[PDB]
Amino acid sequence: LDNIREQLEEEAEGKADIQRQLSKANAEAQLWRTKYESEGVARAEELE
Amino acid sequence: LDNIREQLEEEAEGKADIQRQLSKANAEAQLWRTKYESEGVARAEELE
Numbered sequence: 024l025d026n027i028r029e030q031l032e033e034e035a036e037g038k039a040d041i042q043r044q045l046s047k048a049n050a051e052a053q054l055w056r057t058k059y060e061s062e063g064v065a066r067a068e069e070l071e
Numbered sequence: 072l073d074n075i076r077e078q079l080e081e082e083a084e085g086k087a088d089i090q091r092q093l094s095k096a097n098a099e100a101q102l103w104r105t106k107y108e109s110e111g112v113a114r115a116e117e118l119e
Binding site: 024027030031034037038041042044045048049051052053055056059060063064066067070071 | 072075079082083086090091093094097098100101103104107108111112114115118119
């Protein structure tokens with residue numbers, strides 16, 4: 024019980040970084056897709 | 072102490088799924104973004 028008490032903080036720290044890892048990632052990938060393929064293939068569409 | 076066994080493992084199942092695999096289905100977005108710039112914009116400078 025004193026042992027898994029330490030493990031609960033470890034999974035919490037295992038939680039905390041990986042929820043914060045996605046919030047940087049899912050912002051950037053989705054944002055890039057929204058803002059770089061609107062310029063990308065569409066200006067490639069019209070310039071052709 | 073038996074009750075917090077599932078509070079470990081089901082959250083550990085939650086962290087292994089809802090934090091981990093939902094992150095990796097985001098690696099795909101980043102890959103798509105890289106693919107767009109890398110091939111798309113080299114054309115979009117060349118056709119410019």
